[PDB]
Amino acid sequence: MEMEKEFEQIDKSGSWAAIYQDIRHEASDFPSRVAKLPKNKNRNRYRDVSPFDHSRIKLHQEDNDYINASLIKMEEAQRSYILTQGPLPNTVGHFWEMVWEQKSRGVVMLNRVMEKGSLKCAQYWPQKEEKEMIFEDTNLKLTLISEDIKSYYTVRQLELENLTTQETREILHFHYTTWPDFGVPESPASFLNFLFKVRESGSLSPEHGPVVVHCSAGIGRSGTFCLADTCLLLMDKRKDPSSVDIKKVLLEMRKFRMGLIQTADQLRFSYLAVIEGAKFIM
Ligand SMILES: O=C(O)c1ccc(Oc2ccccc2)cc1
């Protein structure tokens, strides 16, 4: 069924909440035993949002290899993503260790450091060129190289230096700054504009490690980003683009991280973003 007609059908019948609970019901459930270990309690921002054991990213250190992050592997689309929580004051060094060890090129941030008057994530990057950051636990240095502030997003080049080997890499930081404190955007154009910028940069291409994407919990806005990207890539690839079933792609993604798409508004917004993104793709 052409998703554009499925949309109108769901919209007219106002059954978004019903579709969504159906997804919640059939989603995968796998163990998350490492996340729940007592030694890792201060490495989870939210008690109810944990990575599955089978798909969790492991830090290349013997001490404690745990970070709240998951590898989402989309086999038909040939796209991989790491979804993670916003870093905590004690996990900023772990975050940049992961970026280094997975060879990622890009970091995608979908939240503001403060929202609804509370902190949603730490300041894990430097705000001035001459004030670099050093992470002593993971032996890394991070320098701001340039910043590019647009009305609804900011782009930054960063330099990550492995202090143990003095290798350096350019990392691109893509920061969507205008998602509203409550609800979802009215239109997907700026989100759509935002996704193509990430794509252009090379950050999603198989020549690099997987892109790192985060919001506060790493499941809601983050799930919307990778669901829209993968669905548009499949409509690109297949002989029959109308055979792309967004609900089925989402259930597939939920095999790798729990809770992706947090609200029936977010589900409806993911549809809108896809239908409007199809128009450019073909
Ligand atoms: O303290 C910080 O680092 C920080 C950075 C950027 C933020 O997003 C924006 C940027 C421009 C306009 C509206 C929001 C919010 C906090």
- Which residue of 92, 109, 111, 112 sits with most ligand 1 atoms within 8 Å of its CB, as the best mutation to test the pocket? 112
Sort 214 into a burial class: Cβ within 10 Å, 0-12 / 13-18 / 19+: buried
Which tokens is 85 given?
């929580």
Given the CA of residue 127, which atom of ligand 1 is nearest to it? Answer: 3
> What angle in degrees, to the nearest 10, is found between the helix axes of 264-281 and 189-200?
60
Q: Which of 121, 215, 226, 231 is catalytic?
A: 215
User: Other CB atoms closer than 10 Å to residue 165's CB: what's the count?
Assistant: 8
Query: Is the CB of residue 139 below 6 angstroms from any atom belonging to ligand 1?
Result: no
Query: Is the CB of residue 122 below 6 angstroms from any atom belonging to ligand 1?
Result: no
* Residues 102-114: b if buried by 16+ CB within 10 A, e if exposed: bebbbbbbbbbee
Which tokens is 79 given?
């796209």
231 carries an active-site annotation:
no
CATH number at residue 227: 3.90.190.10
Expressed as residue numbers, the domain containing 157 is 1-282
For 22, residues 6+ apart whose C-beta sits below 8 A from its C-beta are none
> Which residue type occupies 142?
L
User: Which among 242, 259, 235, 271 has a CA at the least distance from the CA of 48?
Assistant: 259
E strand or H helix that includes residue 80: strand 79-84
Resolution in A: 1.8
Query: Is the CB of residue 281 below 6 angstroms from any atom belonging to ligand 1?
Result: no
User: For the chain, how many structural domains are there in total?
Assistant: 1
Helix, strand and coil in the chain, % to nearest 5: 35, 20, 40
Determination technique used: X-ray
